[model samples]
Target: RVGNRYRLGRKIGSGSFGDIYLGTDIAAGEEVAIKLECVKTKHPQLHIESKIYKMMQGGVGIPTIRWCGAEGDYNVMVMELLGPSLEDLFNFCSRKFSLKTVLLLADQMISRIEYIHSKNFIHRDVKPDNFLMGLGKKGNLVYIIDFGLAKKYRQHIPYRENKNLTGTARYASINTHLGIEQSRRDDLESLGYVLMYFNLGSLPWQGLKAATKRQKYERISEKKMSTPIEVLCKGYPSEFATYLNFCRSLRFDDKPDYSYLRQLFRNLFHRQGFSYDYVFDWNMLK
Candidate 1:
C-alpha cells in the first residue's frame, strides 16, 4: 500500500506503463483502482495523466481522483473504482448489443467527448475499452479513462507527417491513416466506428490478415476507406449514416456541432418510443 492509507489488492488490469490493482482506502473502507507506474522509465506518464485528471476534476463523466503520488520506486494513483468497460459489456452480450442500449450509450459517450474537447484536449485513443460504466449507484453514468495518449491540440503544431498513428486502427479516422494531425473531428469520427461496432457485431476490418502489423493497419484503412458510408451503414437508421458522414466531413481542427450530433440519436431514441431510463441489457443479467 502507498503510505499505508491505501491497500493494494489483486491486479485487475494493465496498461503500457503498469498494472492496475484492485485497491482500497483503509480509513474510509472504500474500494478504488490503483495504477502503478514504475518510476524508472524514461517515458514517465502517470504524472501528466494525473494532472489532466486534476484539471478535469470538477467535470461530470470524469473520474474522481482521490489521490496520486509517488510511492517508493512506483508511481501510484488511487481513484474511484469503475465497473466493466463497454467492450466488456459488448462481449458479455455475445457481441450483439440492442439498438436501445447503443443509443442510450451514445448520448453519454458524446457528452464525454464534448467534456474532454471543452477542456482543450483530444483523446487520441478512443475505443470501447477506454469507455466504462460506473459502479453500483452510479452505474447508469459512463466514464472515460486512460488519458495516457491524450494531448493538447493547437492548429500551429507542425510536423503532421512526422507523427505516427495514435489510436486503434479499427476505429481510427481515415485521415489518421494518412498521418494527419488528429483533431476534435477525428475523435468524433473514431467514436462513429465505436457506435457502429455496438450496432453491428463487428467491423468489416476485424479479421483481415497481413504480412506485418503496418500492412494490417493499411488493410484496415483500405477497407475503411473503400467501404462507403452508404455500404457501411446500410440497413441502419439514417441518423447513423448522418452521424458518420458529419464526422468524416468535418475539417481538421473544426469544433463539432455536439448538441446536433447528440440530438440525432436522442431523436431516434424518442421516435422509437424508448424511455430515457438508463436500464441497459447488462442490467437484466441474472
Candidate 2:
C-alpha cells in the first residue's frame, strides 16, 4: 500500500534511483506504474523527475502522472504505465531494425526531442532505454522519459567549459566524453549513434573485451572521438554520415534544425519506397 490509495503489485523495473512497480489506484480502479524511492537513500533524482513530469503534464508523448507523495521512509509517485522500451524491442527483433523502421523511429524521436528543447531542457541522457512505446491505443507513439539527468540549456547564454561527463558512455556524444557542457546538439549526436546502432545492429566500439567496466568505457570513448564520420557510417546511406557530420559540427549553443534532420529520414523513406504509414517492423512480426 502507498499513499493509502495505490495497492502496489509486483516490481516491474529498476533504475539508478528507485524501483518501479505495477500498482492500482484503489478508488479510481486504474492501472499505474509507481516509482518508489527510499527517503534514507538521498536520491534527489526522484524529486527532480517528479517536478519535470509536472511541468510536462498534458504534453504530447509525455506520461500522465496520477499521484505523488510519501509513504513511510519512501517517496512514491504513480503515473500511467507504458509499454516496452526500444531497447527491449531491439533485442526482440534480434538486434536489427530495417532502414524503414529506423526512419519511422527517427521521425518520432526527433519530434520528441524538439519538444523537450522547446521547454528549455536538454535531456543529457538520450538512448534507446530512455524511449518507450505506448500501450494499447497509443502503441504507435514513442514517449521520451527518464529526465533525472536533464538540465536547463539557456539558449542565449554563452557556452561554458569543463562540465562533468553526464550520460551513458556507449551512446554519449564525443563532446560529453571531453567533459564539455552539453547542449541540444549533444542530444542529437547521441540520437545519431542510436540510429546507427538500429540500422547496423551494432556500433564499432561494442563487444570490446575489457577487463573492467571503466576500461571498456574509456576504450569506447576513445574510438568514438578518433573515428571519422565516414568510417563510422560506412556501408549505410550517405544521409546518415551527413547527419552525424552535422551534429559534430554544431557549436555548444547552436540550435538544431529539427525539420532538416527529420527530412533526411523522410528522404531515406522515399528512396526505399516506404509510405508514411505507422506499420513498423515490430508490427509486421506480429
Candidate 3:
C-alpha cells in the first residue's frame, strides 16, 4: 500500500516460508510480483535472499527487486515478474525441447551464474525452476530467480562448511554430496548437470538404490554411461556429443574456467550458423 499503488492480487505460488502474488501497479499500469515472507521470527538464512537481491540490482540475468520492507510480521518485497520459468517452458512445449534450444539456454545460464560468482555470490540452487523468461525482443531472455539459497563470500568470510544439504541431491555435485565446502567450481558442476538434464530430457542417474556415495560412484563407474546426444545424434551433428563432454569436464579441481566455457559455446554457435549477435525469440509466433 506504499505510495498508493501496487495491490497484491491472487496468489501465484507458495513455498516453505512465504507466498508470491501477482500484483498490479496502479500508478504505472504495470504488473509485478510481490513476495510476502511471514517473518514473525527471524532466521539468518533470510540474509541469503535479501542480500543477493540487494547486490543483484541492475544485473541483466536476474529480476530486479524494486522495494523491500518489513510490515509487522511480514517481510514484503516488490519484484519485476519475469514470464514463464524453464520448467514452465518444458511443460508447455510437451517436454521436448531441441538440443539447440537447450544449448542456448545453457549458455545464457552459465553467463549469468559466472557473473554472479564474479560478484562473490554462490547460488546454491541452480535448477530449471529458477530460470524465468524476460520480456524482450529475444523472448528467450532468461533471468535467474529465487536466490534463497545463495551465499555471499566477502574477502575472508568462509562459506558454510558441513551444513545441511542445501539443494536437490539429483543435481548436486560430488563435493556437495560429500558435505564439503561449496566453491564456484561446484556450482558450475551442478549447472552442468542441469544442462545435461535439459539436453537429455532425463537424469543420467535416475533410479539406483545405492546406500552411500561410494556405492553410487561404484555403480556409475561400472555401468556403461552414455548421454542422450551420444545415442540420438548418431551421424548428424555428433559435435553436440563433444560439447557435452566438455561440459561434463566440470570436475571439482579440474573444471575449466568460465572463459573456456564461453569459447566452447562460441564454437558451438558458429557450427549452428548463429553468431552471438543473432536475433531470436521464444514467442509462439517465432
Candidate 4:
C-alpha cells in the first residue's frame, strides 16, 4: 500500500500502463479501486486524469477519487470501487439486454460524457470496460472510469500524430481511425456502437474486416453498410432507429454535441412512453 490508510488486495485487471487492484480504506472501512502506474518514465496522463477527476467530483455517474500521490517513480490513485463492468454484467446475464435497459444505459453514459466535454475534456476512451454498474443502494447507477487516454478539446489539435491510438479500435469512429483528434461527436459514434453491442453482441464491421477502407467508407456514406446504427434499426422501434441514425450522422463538423443528444434522448424516451429522469436513475433497473 502506498499509504497506511489503504491496503491493496487482489489484482483485478492490468493493462499496458498499470494494474488495477481491489483495495480497502482502513479508517473508513470502505472499498476502493486503486490504479497503479509502474512505468519508469513520467506519464503526463496521470496528472491529467487526476485533475479531471478532481474537477468531476460529485458530478453524476463518475467515480470519486479519494486520494492520489506519487511514491518514488510510481503514481497511484484511489477511487470508489464500483461493481461489475457492463461487459461483466453482459456475461453474467448472457447478453439479453432489453431495449429499456439499453436506453437507460445509453442515456447515463451520454450525459456523463456531455458533462466531461463541457469541461473541455473529451473521453478519448469510450468503451464497455470504462463503465461500471454500482452495487447495493447504488447498484443500478453507471459510472465512467479510466481517463488515461483522454485529451482536452483544442481547436487546432493535430490528428493522427500520437503514436499510441487513444481509444479502442473496434468502437472508434472513422475519423478516429484516420488518426483525427477526438471531438464530442466521436464520443457519440462510439456510444452508438456500444448501444448496438449491448443489444446484438456484435458490430457492423465484424465480417467486413477484409474490405478496404475506401470500400467501407463508400458503404457507410451510402448507408448501405452494416453499421451499428443500421443493425440497431433492423426490426426495432422506428423512433429509436431514427435516433441511431442521428448518432451515425455525427461525423467531423456535422456532429451534434451533448445538449443536442440529450434532447434527442428525451424525445426518444417520450416516444417510448418512459420518464426522462429514469434514464439516469440507478434505482430504475430493479
lDDT assessment of candidate 4: 0.71
Return model 4's CA RMSD, one decimal: 4.4
Residue 84 accuracy (lDDT) in model 1: 94
TM-score of 3: 0.79
Report every candidate's CA lDDT: 0.89, 0.87, 0.67, 0.71
Ranking by TM-score: 1, 2, 4, 3
Which scores higher on lDDT, 1 or 4?
Answer: 1
**For residues 180-216, could you state the per-residue lDDT of candidate 2 as single tens digits?**
7888998999999999999888888888778996788
> Candidate 4 residues 184-215, lDDT tens each?
77787787778777777766555543378667
Model 3: per-residue Cα lDDT over 36-56, one tens digit each: 887765663443476677887
TM-score of each: 0.97, 0.95, 0.79, 0.81
After superposing candidate 1 on the true structure, give the runs of residues whose Cα lies further than 4 Å from its correct spot. Answer: 155-159
- Which runs of model 3 end up more than 4 angstroms from their true locations? 15-17, 42-48, 136-138, 154-163, 207-256, 275-286
Across 1-286, the per-residue lDDT of candidate 1 in tens digits comes to 6857999899988854578889889999899999999999888999889999999988887989999898999998899999999999999988888889999999999999999998889998889999889998899999999899898875535436535786788899888988888889989999999998898989998999899978988899899999998788898888989999999899776789999999999999999999989989998889
Number of backbone-clashing residue pairs for each candidate, in the order shown: 0, 0, 0, 2
Q: Which 10-residue window in model 4 sums to the lowest lDDT?
A: 276-285
**After aligning candidate 4 to the native by TM-score, how far in Å is the CA of 160 from where it should be?**
7.4
Residue pairs in clash, model 3: none
Off by over 4 Å in 2: 155-158
